[PDB]
Amino acid sequence: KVINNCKIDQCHAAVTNHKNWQYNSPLVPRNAELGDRKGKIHIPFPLANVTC
Amino acid sequence: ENTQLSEAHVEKSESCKTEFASAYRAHTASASAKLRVLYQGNNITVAAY
Ligand SMILES: *[C@@H]1O[C@H](CO)[C@@H](O)[C@H](O)[C@H]1NC(C)=O
Ligand SMILES: *[C@@H]1O[C@H](CO)[C@@H](O)[C@H](O)[C@H]1NC(C)=O
């Protein structure tokens, strides 16, 4: 597109069409007031008893 | 005129099934004993409360 008589320092842009899911890190902002849960993954490597 | 919202709460760790400490209250105890007796040239053993 082109905008007539509308300088830079006055506009904004972003990309908004996504098809994959992402972890909800505390370092990234929420997309909506109430989150939309899609799935979950597990944490490996559990504990056990041994001797040393 | 922007704002930020933050929240947090506390839960119980998963590892509590293996690493934990327990508190008990104690009462009167029982007793038991075991003996050796030399009887008519042989050794015999007994066990009782
Ligand atoms: C062994 O592991 C079980 C659970 O996996 C736990 O209940 C028990 O206390 C453990 N024993 C020792 C000696 O760590
Ligand atoms: C068993 O009896 C013998 C005597 O016949 C004695 O010398 C021995 O010490 C007794 N056993 C034990 C464990 O005391």
Residues B31, B49: contact at Cβ < 8 Å?
A: yes
| Separation of first and last alpha carbons in chain A | 69
Q: Which of A47, A50, A35 is nearest to B13 (CA)?
A: A47
Chain A, residues 22-51, CB within 8 A of chain B, namely 47, 49
The technique by which this structure was obtained is: cryo-EM
Interchain CB distance below 8 Å, B15 and A47: yes
Please give the Cα distance from B40 to B44 (Å, whole number). 10
| Residues contacting residue B31 through CB under 8 Å, at least 6 positions apart | B49
Residues A29, A47: contact at Cβ < 8 Å?
A: no
A10 lines ligand 1 (CB under 6 A): no
Please state whether beta strands B33-39 and B42-48 pair in parallel, antiparallel, or not at all (unpaired).
antiparallel
A49 lines ligand 1 (CB under 6 A): yes
